[PDB]
Design a protein around this ligand. Sequence first.
Ligand SMILES: CC1CCN(C(=O)c2cc3ccccc3o2)CC1
Ligand SMILES: [Cl-]
Ligand SMILES: [Zn+2]
Ligand SMILES: [Zn+2]
Length: 583
Amino acid sequence: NLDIIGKRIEKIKQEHETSWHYDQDHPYKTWAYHGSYETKQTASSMVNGVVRLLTKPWDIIPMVTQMAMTKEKVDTRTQEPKEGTKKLMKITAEWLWKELGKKKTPRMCTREEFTRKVRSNAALGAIKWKSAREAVEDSGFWELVDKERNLHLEGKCETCVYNMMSRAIWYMWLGARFLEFEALGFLNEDHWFSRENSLSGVEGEGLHKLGYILRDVSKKEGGAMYADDTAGWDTRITLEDLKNEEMVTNHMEGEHKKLAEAIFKLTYQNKVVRVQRPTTVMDIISRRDQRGSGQVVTYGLNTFTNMEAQLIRQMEGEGVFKSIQHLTVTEEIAVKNWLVRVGRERLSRMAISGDDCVVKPLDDRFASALTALNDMGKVRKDIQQWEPSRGWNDWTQVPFCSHHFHELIMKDGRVLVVPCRNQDELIGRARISQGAGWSLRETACLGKSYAQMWSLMYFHRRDLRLAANAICSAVPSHWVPTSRTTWSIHATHEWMTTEDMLTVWNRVWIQENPWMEDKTPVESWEEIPYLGKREDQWCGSLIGLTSRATWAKNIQTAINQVRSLIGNEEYTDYMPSMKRFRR
Ligand SMILES: CC1CCN(C(=O)c2cc3ccccc3o2)CC1
Ligand SMILES: [Cl-]
Ligand SMILES: [Zn+2]
Ligand SMILES: [Zn+2]
């Protein structure tokens, strides 16, 4: 307890000795409260004016406009699983880390890799120096990391504290993030959750492949496809989950092993967190369970634990084991022989991205196999605890990573599987920018990032192909796309480029696409088809409305408004790539 968190707690008390007070009005039951000190401090969503001026019909659609305006889950506790549950989880975790390790070598990530990440600008969740980029050069920072690092090898921790701010993001100081990245970065940096290595994973696949992947799961013999979301996944990670995740250190050696064992032991299985309570004060609270790590390591361990949970739900539906209460010795033998005999085949029946999953089990007994899943604390969202899962019968209706997928037949008979979501969501997200101080140039370059993503991923939506052409016509041709349209770890961001978008489309959808046999290049945007007119309207298209027809017909006036604001620059007209503007 305080033997592991004490140093951190006592160090904080000393930097706020003037203010320290053991309050009696602390709203913590499940979190252990330690003390409080004086604070005075808090970034809301800003609108992107380039995208808004070029999407005027949506200015009167509340689903779009409300996206730009702007607890009882973090302060709960999960029961400890039954003994049979613990046994299933240890055996499956042991086996899963062995499978993920067969063709990969755990290894430390480097200052250099971390330096390039911050220099290339990435979302690490950080807080003497003001910018992360500057701290990477001030050797004093690296001496602070060295100081901490040697404490970790001594099995102690001084500065690895969380700043808390169905979401809450646990920021840490850049040095705390370096040491996490050094010890566990390999999981993401070397693609341990790729489909090739994990069979169930989709890390680095890209949104152009997820649909083809769901269609390949559909080709397997079995029952419905199940996509049960969990109710607040990060808050349901048990210390037993944290202990099965830690068994990755069993595959490590030397310094690496000691560094990873201390991240698990001292930051994950024992946390210290500063919450900013308006009543304002800074509470120093602690706890052993729940997820609280870097977003990228959180993705990897979520995928791992979810892969484990879903194989165990599959075992339960196949009657590999009778009850979670206690596992017989012969049932343990059976679970292992099951894993050895068909583990890899059953991983390939899944697509898993963090807390999100699609399972095509052997048959529909999976639907009522709920005891292990509820007893692991992975309670399904929006359905009665003991009510059977509603499956899907068509892979084109299954939700995954906030998308559904359409089969789209090109004029030449070749078959695209394309991602899609309600168009109000796509336009509402492109109208939002994060953070302060953006120039008009930076704003335009973020608008251009969204526009190129739409041209590559959502070309089949009439309204997004037109708006993407308008935005690319309205931003200087040579200005480079900036920021991130998305942070999804499945994403590959082929739209972040100044290459010609028809050249990228051909590479992504034809040349590099293993589901396309005939590699005949497409020569024009007119060869590239749309969803049916009715399919387009069902997924939120404004085609057949008057506001939309005025917008499309007068698009060159909206393009000219934005060109006049940006000023006298080199622009290209992309509207003639569409038939209706081709004179
Ligand atoms: C649900 C149906 C969609 C097609 N309809 C149109 O009126 C239409 C098609 C179209 C294509 C491009 C620009 C405007 C457009 O309007 C009828 C209703
Ligand atoms: Cl269905
Ligand atoms: Zn530490
Ligand atoms: Zn759709």
